Curated annotation (Swiss-Prot), chain C:
Protein name: NADH-quinone oxidoreductase subunit K
Protein source organism: Mycolicibacterium smegmatis (strain ATCC 700084 / mc(2)155) (Mycobacterium smegmatis)
Top-level taxon of the source organism: Bacteria
GO molecular function, one term: NADH:ubiquinone reductase (non-electrogenic) activity
Pfam families documented for this protein: Oxidored_q2
Disulfide bonds: none
Length: 518, 518, 99, 55, 190
């Protein structure tokens, strides 16, 4: 009965509170304490995952309390296979991002000496609020945390960043908050509809009850209202997890923010968009999702190819990785909205693999960018000679983001592509071209940077490119280790994800299409 | 003979008797002892008023409410809620008003941090004004005037007939007309603000009284319940009822500051003393909206189909013009003024609900928003130019948060609350009003309010950008903490804005229990 | 003569009062126009009270006159301070706060 | 080009529209109390709307 | 509902005076003329109140507004001028036309809203004034409207406080006395 889920999200926020409250002189102690809180949250995640039985009921570790009955929302947490997977992703990443951004806040001034403490506390608050969103089984609670986590990252981008930090932070927050406010419109519409229907005792936000009612058919509502509410949810989840048209904010912010914070935005937080698409959009609005399924599928595939192309066209390392993440988000959304067990399971595993892979690749690029203070690709050359280990890890990460079977991401992309073929073969081929496009923007980048004659000031002067330090080794090794393990033996993660995907597909009245042959 | 419910009328009676006693202190107390007594007499009185209200709340536990003076005053749950809110906001406002100068080397410390000119009758910058400042004299008459305003604003929600509302409107307005012209610096601007507010307030009150005349003509009575019986009974002149409702609405909308009638607020809030700005922006909004709730939920419910379409448009305009005009405003005080303009429309949405959820949401919105606005204006008062003038140009605020992380964080909390980001009372508040509007059939207003809030988040966020994401300029304004009274106001206000956002069910149950008028 | 005529007159007077507040710069003239609006409201109250066979509106006229007197005095105080600072009673001159 | 000019350009155009409209509205605050009073008296838009609400 | 033709004549002449007085208040370019026109309008409205079976209200109107317009005339002489003939020239681009249009529109709309009302039942005031018009007003004021009557005291006090705070000038700006002036190196005669 222990509040495992509640503690899981509480610990990061309380840790941020303690950290920001430390004396400025305890900066080193602040770093260590933040790392310790992250590790404690990861241990909580470990116990939650171990106790979770994917063969058991859909929702586990369910904690329920009354929070705001006037709004029909209660503090209800419960972790399913998909939420468990993303929770494990967030937990494993956050300590690594902390030890990745160890010195990121050193060169800041002001904040009464709390710049390091502010950085770490903001990171912890983001981690905890993302966790709260993931394990929240209350629509309004989830929206609360989903929208609010924009603010800690808005600060984390604006402070602790490059020259365009102000502009990129504003664009990020405004895009995402406009989406969130559209989802607030949709949330209030959903509350009104539930209040207008006899299926519920009163206007309700309990996700489980609403899902059960819509599945049981009792909660019968006009398809027009459902379409509009679905669109409201979709706009916010699309701007959050960048669906092609709305991606525009992510490139700048990822470029401007410090690499650890940018990875925290992309690998962890942006996932919450697709997560919502998987949990709410499909399981609240099955008929609307089906009706809009072709258009969203088209948008996701176009996003895949479009992000791949733009990454190809990027002169900037960080912008290239951001567009690569956009294309991978296109993959995730495509796999989620194809409503195929292969598709949804592959897209969940793809959220995991893309989180880890982008984290590794982007952090390696961030170290390289730190060594020489230029983000321009042409500013480098022959780095493979000076920093062999940096180049090796960068190549491994690229291979991961390249969807090579020897690494994790392939297992997912494949699964998604397979899923897309059973319902939209043209779209499946259109996305499969991204296998080629990924090779392009990955290997061309590595060629321009690591190979060729060593560029000026690369191995000499005041800005040489020194190899990876031990701390960067600690950051990098676990990520590549997970990539290898999940590529070789995804069986545990897939076994966790599949029951949740099957539950979802049963919920929305969809099934994997039968093979052509009888 | 008439029966006077003294126990009921206790809060207003206490405030008005305290105001009279304060005028006595001015009349027959020596100079040096006036301020210590007034701030003693005022604050205690309001605290007593607060106490009275809670007992009155206990008194109305069984019955829904009661009239007091043979009509003309009805203490019901909404009335006691609004009176308690106004009492708390008045306590905070008087703690701001009583703040004296930061005695540096001389004993001329005289109620200057309150921003009140030592002798308002003197020509600004005259040798007489300078000599008064050197001698450290203060026009303590401010304390009674403020109290009188509160008295009126206490009654104006509780007035149960047109004559009492009109008298209370004048009683609260005249003190504010006078107070707006007493600022310590930029005396020209304060005097202009006082003149504008007087002229436009007199205009609006003339409309208010003429509408009261039309309502009386239609109904044959001016007790609100009698007007409701007439309009519902169909016996009165429907056209006169409508015209009177419209003309009365003109005055009440001026008081709250709807876009057709908002033009005063920018100038008045800019030029008025920052303390008085903070006090009024909460108290007058609360009192005016309470009266408008009473008129639209007691006096004239039956004509909803007749006045709903009007408020709709107003609300629309209020949210749009109020927010858009703020997007490109460059002065912090004026930006907060336009923010108040927009939040008036946000309130009006939940008033348009015309359902009990409308009343509950409106009461919560007024409480939380009044507190937040008072805190934000107090903070804006703490920031000083090198010359002492309250630095309000946004450019001078660059890096203000970095130089003062605590005040920066508190002000950012207030801004996020105004934007309505979750975890702040401002979210819960806007959510409640929007939910009432949607449940009441006014979903389109919820959508327009969503869009308006999305637009307003930009100007709310640019200020946080200036505080934290920019390095302080060469001449950055310093933070003057004049006295522990202002600190207490800021702390209480921010703590309320945060707690009432995280765990709002306290005071939200009280808002619900105040959903019905007598 | 239909009693309603009084209301029309009141409506006219208020209207003129309104127009005055918009057209005349001199603060004293603005105050007199506001007094015209308040007195028009009083006339409407008196006519309606006569119509309804009760003195309520006549009572309300007293309180309106009281409010008019207090409003005029407050405006006079504000104008006296402004005139001391500026030596001008024109409202248009109080234009510093804008945009 | 599409990204920098169409996708980003649409958002930038919406921002420019908001900013231009904000400037145009802010011009409405001429600072003349009689202009504010003129807006309030044009508030008889409320009177006409409520009267026309019967039809 | 048609009141005695005598009342018709009284209304026509007196309301003509009142309407012309308001128009002169708005239009007279000498502020003293506008003050006198306001006094005329107040007197006319008092006459109308008397004619509408409201003696005390009309008489108090005459008294109090005699006082008020006298003071407003004094303030015109102080702050504006003794016989200053103001230009009344539109200083805000096109504002005069907009104000005229808005005022006329509001007047037309208010007249439309009022429309025919008296035809719907006009209960004379005789049953009310019987026993004393002032007696009835006292009954109402101190029984039903006692709270508003009390708050009029707050209005009065606030007006006094505003006058003292903004108008009264303390010692610092006090003008020197003749006694004071003669002194100080024998001022004004040395």
């Amino acid at each position: 009965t222990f509040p495992w889920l509640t503690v899981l999200w509480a610990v990061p926020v309380v840790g941020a509170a303690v950290v920001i409250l430390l004396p400025a002189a305890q900066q080193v102690l602040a770093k260590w304490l933040a790392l310790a809180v992250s590790v404690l949250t990861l241990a909580v995640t470990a116990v939650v995952a171990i106790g979770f039985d994917p063969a058991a009921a859909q929702y586990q570790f369910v904690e329920s309390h009354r929070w705001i009955p006037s709004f029909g929302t209660g503090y209800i947490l419960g972790v399913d296979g998909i939420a468990l997977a993303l929770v494990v992703l967030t937990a494993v990443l956050v300590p690594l991002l902390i030890i990745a951004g160890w010195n990121d806040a050193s060169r800041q001034t002001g904040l009464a000496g709390r710049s390091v403490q502010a950085y770490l506390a903001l990171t912890l608050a983001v981690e905890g609020m993302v966790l709260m969103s993931l394990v929240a089984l209350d629509i309004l609670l989830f929206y609360v945390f989903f929208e609010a986590m924009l603010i800690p990252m808005y600060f984390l981008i604006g402070g602790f960043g490059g020259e365009n930090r102000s502009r990129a932070a504003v664009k990020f927050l405004l895009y995402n908050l406009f989406g969130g406010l559209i989802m607030l419109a949709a949330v209030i519409g959903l509350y009104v509809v539930t209040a207008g229907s006899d299926a519920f005792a009163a206007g309700t936000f309990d996700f489980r009850e609403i899902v059960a009612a819509v599945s049981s058919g009792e909660f019968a509502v006009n398809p027009a209202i459902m379409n509009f509410l679905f669109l409201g949810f979709m706009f916010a989840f699309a701007v959050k997890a960048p669906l092609w048209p709305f991606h525009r904010w992510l490139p700048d912010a990822a470029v401007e923010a410090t690499p650890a914070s940018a990875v925290l935005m992309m690998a962890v937080m942006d996932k919450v968009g697709t997560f919502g698409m998987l949990r709410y959009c499909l399981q609240l609005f099955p008929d609307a999702s089906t009706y809009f399924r072709p258009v969203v599928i088209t948008l996701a595939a176009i996003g895949i190819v479009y992000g791949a192309v733009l990454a190809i066209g990027q002169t900037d390392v960080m912008r290239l990785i951001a567009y690569t993440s956009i294309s991978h988000f296109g993959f995730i959304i495509l796999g989620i909205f194809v409503m195929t067990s292969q598709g949804q399971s592959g897209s969940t595993l793809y959220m995991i693999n893309h989180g880890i892979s982008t984290a590794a690749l982007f952090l390696i690029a961030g170290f390289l960018v730190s060594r020489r203070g230029s983000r321009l690709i042409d500013s480098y050359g022959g780095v493979q000679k000076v920093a062999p280990v940096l180049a090796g890890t960068f190549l491994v990460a690229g291979l991961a983001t390249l969807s090579l079977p020897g690494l994790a991401p392939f297992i997912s992309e494949f699964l998604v592509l397979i899923g897309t073929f059973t319902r939209y073969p043209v779209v499946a081929v259109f996305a499969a071209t991204a296998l080629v496009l990924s090779a392009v923007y990955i290997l061309w980048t590595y060629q321009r940077m690591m190979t060729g004659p060593v560029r000026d000031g690369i191995g000499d002067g005041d800005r040489p490119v020194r190899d990876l330090v031990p701390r960067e080794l600690v950051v990098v090794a676990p990520l590549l280790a997970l990539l290898l393990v999940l590529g070789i033996y995804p069986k545990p993660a897939l076994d966790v994800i599949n029951p949740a995907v099957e539950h979802t597909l049963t919920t929305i009245g969809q099934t994997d299409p039968e093979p052509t042959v009888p | 003979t008439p029966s006077i419910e003294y126990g009921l009328l206790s809060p207003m009676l206490i405030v008005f008797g305290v105001a009279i006693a304060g005028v006595l202190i001015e009349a027959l107390a020596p100079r040096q002892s006036r301020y210590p007594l007034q701030v003693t007499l005022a604050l205690g009185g309001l605290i007593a008023t607060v106490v009275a209200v809670v007992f009155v709340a206990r008194g109305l536990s069984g019955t829904p409410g009661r009239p007091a003076v043979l009509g003309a005053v009805v203490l019901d749950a909404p009335a006691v809620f609004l009176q308690g809110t106004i009492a708390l906001v008045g306590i905070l406002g008087i703690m701001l008003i009583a703040e004296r100068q930061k005695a540096t080397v001389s004993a001329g410390e005289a109620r200057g941090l309150e921003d009140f000119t030592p002798q308002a009758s003197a020509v600004a910058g005259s040798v007489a004004e300078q000599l008064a400042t050197k001698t450290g004299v203060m026009q303590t008459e401010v304390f009674p005037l403020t109290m009188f305003a509160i008295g009126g604003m206490l009654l104006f929600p509780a007035a149960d007939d047109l004559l009492t509302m009109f008298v209370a409107l004048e009683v609260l307005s005249l003190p504010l007309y006078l107070l707006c012209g007493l600022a310590r610096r930029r005396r020209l601007l304060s005097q202009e603000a006082a003149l504008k507010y007087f002229l436009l307030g007199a205009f609006s009150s003339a409309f208010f009284i003429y509408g009261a005349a039309m309502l009386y003509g239609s109904a044959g009575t001016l007790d609100l319940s009698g007007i409701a019986e007439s309009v519902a009974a169909g016996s009165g002149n429907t056209s006169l009822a409508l015209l009177g409702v419209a003309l009365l609405l003109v005055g009440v909308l001026f008081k709250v500051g709807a876009v057709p009638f908002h033009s005063w607020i920018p100038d008045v809030y800019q030029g008025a003393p920052t303390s008085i700005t903070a006090f009024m922006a909460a108290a007058t909004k609360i009192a005016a909206f309470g009266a408008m709730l009473r008129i639209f939920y007691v006096a004239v419910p039956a004509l909803r189909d007749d006045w709903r379409p009007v408020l709709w448009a107003i609300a629309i305009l209020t949210m749009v013009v109020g927010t858009v005009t703020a997007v490109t405003q460059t002065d912090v005080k004026r930006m907060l003024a336009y923010s108040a303009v927009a939040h008036s429309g946000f309130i009006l949405t939940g008033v348009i609900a015309a359902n009990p959820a409308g009343v509950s949401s409106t009461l919560f919105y007024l409480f939380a928003y009044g507190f937040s606005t008072l805190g934000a204006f107090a903070v804006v008062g703490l920031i000083r130019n090198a010359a002492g003038d309250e630095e309000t140009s946004m450019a001078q605020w660059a890096g203000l948060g970095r130089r003062y992380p605590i005040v920066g964080v508190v002000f950012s909390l207030f801004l996020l609350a105004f934007a309505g980001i979750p975890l702040t009372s401002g979210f819960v508040s806007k959510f409640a009003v929007f939910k009432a509007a949607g449940e009441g059939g006014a979903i389109p207003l919820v959508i327009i309010g969503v869009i308006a809030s999305a637009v307003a988040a930009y100007f709310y966020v640019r200020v946080i950008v200036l505080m934290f994401f920019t390095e302080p300029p060469d001449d950055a304004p310093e933070l003057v903490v004049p006295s522990g009274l202002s600190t207490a106001v800021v702390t209480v206000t921010a703590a309320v804005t945060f707690a009432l956002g995280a765990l709002p069910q306290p005071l939200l149950d009280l808002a619900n229990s105040a959903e019905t008028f007598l | 003569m239909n009693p309603d005529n009084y209301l029309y007159l009141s409506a006219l007077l208020f209207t003129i009062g309104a127009a005055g507040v918009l057209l005349r710069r001199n603060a004293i003239v603005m105050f007199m126009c506001v007094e015209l609006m308040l007195n028009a409201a009083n006339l409407a109250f008196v006519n309606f009270s006569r119509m309804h066979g009760q003195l309520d509106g006549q009572v309300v006229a007293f309180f309106t006159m009281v409010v008019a007197a207090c409003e005029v005095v407050v405006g006079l105080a504000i104008i006296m301070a402004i005139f001391r600072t500026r030596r001008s009673a024109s409202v248009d001159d109080a234009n510093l706060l804008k945009h | 080009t599409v990204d920098d000019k169409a996708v980003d350009g649409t958002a930038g155009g919406l921002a420019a529209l908001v900013s231009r409209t904000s400037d145009a509205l802010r011009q409405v605050q001429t600072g003349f109390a009689r202009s504010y009073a003129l807006s309030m008296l044009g508030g008889s838009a409320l009177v006409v709307a409520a009267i026309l609400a019967v039809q | 509902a048609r009141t005695s033709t005598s009342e018709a004549v009284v209304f026509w002449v007196v309301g003509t005076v009142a309407l012309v007085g308001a128009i002169g208040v708005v239009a007279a370019r000498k502020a003293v003329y506008s003050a006198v026109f306001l006094a005329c309008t107040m007197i006319s409205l008092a006459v109308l109140y008397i004619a509408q079976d409201a003696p005390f209200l009309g008489v108090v109107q005459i008294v109090v507004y005699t006082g008020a317009v006298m003071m407003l005339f004094l303030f015109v002489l102080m702050l504006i001028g003794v016989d200053l003939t103001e230009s009344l020239v539109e200083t805000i681009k096109g504002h005069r036309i907009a104000a005229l249009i808005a005022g006329a529109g509001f007047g037309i709309l208010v007249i439309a809203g009022i429309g025919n009302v008296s035809v719907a039942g006009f209960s004379g005031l005789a049953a009310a004034n019987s026993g004393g018009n002032v007696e009835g007003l006292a009954a109402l004021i101190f029984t039903r409207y006692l709270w508003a009557f009390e708050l009029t005291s707050a209005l009065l006090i606030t007006a006094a406080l505003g006058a003292m705070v903004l108008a009264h000038r303390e010692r610092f700006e006090r003008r020197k006395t003749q006694r004071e002036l003669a002194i100080e190196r024998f001022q004004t005669g040395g």
